[PDB]
């Protein structure tokens, strides 16, 4: 149990000190070490630290050109192997230096738990990954579910850092470790995740045949005792209760999902015109936050009109029936127009709904429009609102249907909170950016409203990638607003964000600032020194530039510095090729 | 009883110097030391200081590889134990360098008083915690009650830093030390605290069932002569006079009023607001708490608040509801089948939705959509809808809190008054309520207390204990709740309103609120935040230490003493959880 001796040739301070590695021992860059010293009074003090600097030097060589002779042993010299320890905790809080010559050892048992502040975690610790030699890393669940800490934020080079895989692992850990019941001691968990990568998120229902092979290879290499999942205490199995939703293909009443390689088990999801109006979906059409005009007054006004109009609807249908649409000279044709038994037009398509908005705002009274709808708003602002609806109508029109019947509508409505479902996967990769931002906006706002009305209830995890897309640093959008609501109010409300981006400096400062858990994959060279990565010490930056895929640094409030960690291969399928018959 | 001698190998200056720790003594990083030197004419000069750096080195080892041999005794080397002193005080204020070889000693009873400027705190000193595993650290109450100082601002990582516990400890110390009596020689103490945690602050009048074992364990470990509370001189009992207020459960359609508390069903009083009082006390501005990014609704809110205030004054009845005679529903979708009508044909608004409906009618339906001209003072239609839409959006959340249905006697009993006679501590339960209701309740109570002090004068010291200060007083937003916090910060000293506020980072809080705190306490700080400009009052030496501070461990900084002082405080004598209750 001897790894080295505290060095006296370098200063020995309570925060930082060096030690010499014993012969036959190897000290890695991230190794967690404990050294115990004796006070003059005789009472002991334990120092728990992490190695941030490791070096090897030749102590007696006068010139670098004598190195060939020195290695041979012809010239007298001694190789010196030393490490620097960054103090994280002192069991007795005495800020006195350890004596040179004190024994340094790897934290392995109770010492390792003390170093990672597992005593503060208590029953709330659950596996956040693997340490150097198969020891699990305790993650304090109370800082994920909102008791004392907020959400999770993952950063790293997209394509190189494995951000989404680590998120899915954390969901697996949270769902299968039992910490939800332990911290509850309402005690359950749900997750909503969006497939935008192809069909990668679409087979996490099935076991991954390649997991065993790849697992055993790594197991034999690093010499772990059992399978990496077994070391964390987690079953190597897929997600138990999974729902796959997809958009409704492409003037046919029949509906079947846009998915190609996975066709079995996938359910189409659609919105109705009536629900569109009733549930104030209109703002989530305007996802261009990068820079724009102030349509807030127009959107709010038309939104309220549509809501009141939807509430007045007595019919059972899914479309919206309006009685004040006349076509003295509207390009729109009276044919193909569902007409009510009361002479009202029943809007069955999104393009018809925009046509009616054009009429109320721009054609109604020889061009000045219906004053109840245009509330003194300028013609230029109205037509901006109109033209943007026209621009996205083709892309949103298949997702919003009024021609569907009530049977189909109740069946196909996307509910991330459906009973008996733990993981909802919404397949948006076939949709355009406008349909993506629309669907994400509506669904997130639906979950937020529901938790506002009822309460914390079940803790709902939202796993979102490309955070810079949805919540830019400088823009302002509705979809960014619901993510702000989730970040700032989600702890108490029970909506927890597991978000990832290539760089946190491109994400809204209030989303990133509210993540209790920060996880860093391989970081770009320039990004590591940015202000948003101050929680990584300078020691880590050079290492972080070359971190291998699968390797993350996790930082959480309980323990002061980031800890490097690895995590197993997915027990679930992430592409079509990994599914047995 | 000397701990070392001034070192000549490092420069000796009046402000900063090194000393060598003598054999058999241990010198900690935050230890208070005193050194005495002698002028050539024989007069003595005393240096009171704090250690900020401490180190150990091998003096004679020529190669690092030797260490193993050197430890065995085969090679000669000596361990060099040295500490650096940051001078806080010079008692004869002669800025001369101490002479090398002078004797360094731990600060003694009287020497400790001089080092912590206790002489400046004649009798206003009260216990602020335990320092250096030793003696109580004196806190100047005159910098907390506003005679010479403002309020307290506590900062640290929520969850690990023990921020709220240190605030409650300070309250206990102020209220039991008798320092209120001493500083008097209109000299009484009151405290308002909001429970935003899950019923954590609802058991402050119950004794801590595990505070004896936990304190005892600490006493055994550090060999203290007596208990930590005993060492401070403060009794180890809970808050004596406590008021617990909670919102009403099943508020909509239920006349019976019952509090929303689940864990504690005894001694908790339900608190409700009344529609006439809402109009009379101009509480409308507090409904608009979303200052993150907002429209210029200031004129509409001001316009309606005055109209509502005048309407309340016009009421002739003693009834809680508001009576309006100018509301009609020709085409407005507000059925009157369930409504209360006055003797003179007026309508009595008993529900929050009804008040908003009346406002919607005056603003948007009164004259074929034009609206009553007196009510909308040439405000754009979009601006009126934004004001109306926000009220409808928040109506379900504030409806249980604002009731016009109750009788005057019922309302008088239920109104939440922090200044109620015979009450020293008031706890308002806000955990059940939504963020909008929470923001509305804090602003109304703070403004009512602040306004009452302005008319009456400062007859009592009201301590307002508020966590998550970034939420209520953001750095760049502008809100009514921020404005009442600003009034408390900038005018509370003379007015007697003292803010004990806590945030995870002062960087997220309004510069004026943090700048007006005379006392600054720091728990374990985030790695990034120590480098920031809001934490310049920590010397650079402290930063690396502050990154790893344990729960229970705080650095307190006050104007009388130049550098921060590391402190510990006892475990709470009051219950902070349902299981910590002692029967």
Numbering used by the authors:
A (entry chain B): 13 to 197, 206 to 270, 273 to 603
B (entry chain A): 13 to 197, 206 to 603
What does the literature reporting this entry say, word for word?
The nuclease NurA and the ATPase/translocase HerA play a vital role in repair of double-strand breaks (DSB) during the homologous recombination in archaea. Each drHerA protomer comprises three domains: the N-terminal HerA-ATP synthase barrel domain (HAS-barrel domain) that forms the putative exit for the substrate, the RecA-like ATPase domain, and the helix-bundle domain which is inserted into the RecA-like ATPase domain and forms the putative entrance for the substrate.
Full-length drHerA without any ligand was crystallized in space group P3121 and the apo structure was solved at 3.0 Å resolution by single-wavelength anomalous diffraction (SAD) phasing using selenomethionine-substituted protein crystals and then refined with the native data. The refined drHerA apo structure contains one hexamer (six protomers) in the asymmetric unit. Not as apo ssoHerA that predominantly exists as a heptamer in solution, drHerA in both nucleotide-free and ADP-binding modes have been crystallized as sixfold symmetrical rings. The six N-terminal HAS-barrel domains from the hexamer formed a pore with an approximately 28.5 Å diameter that is large enough for B-form dsDNA threading. A pore with an approximately 24.5 Å diameter was formed by the helix-bundle domains, which is enough for the entry of the B-form dsDNA. Although the last fourteen residues of the C-terminal protrusion are disordered in our drHerA structures, we believe they are too short to stretch into the neighboring protomer. However, drHerA spontaneously forms a stable hexamer in the absence of DNA or other cofactors.
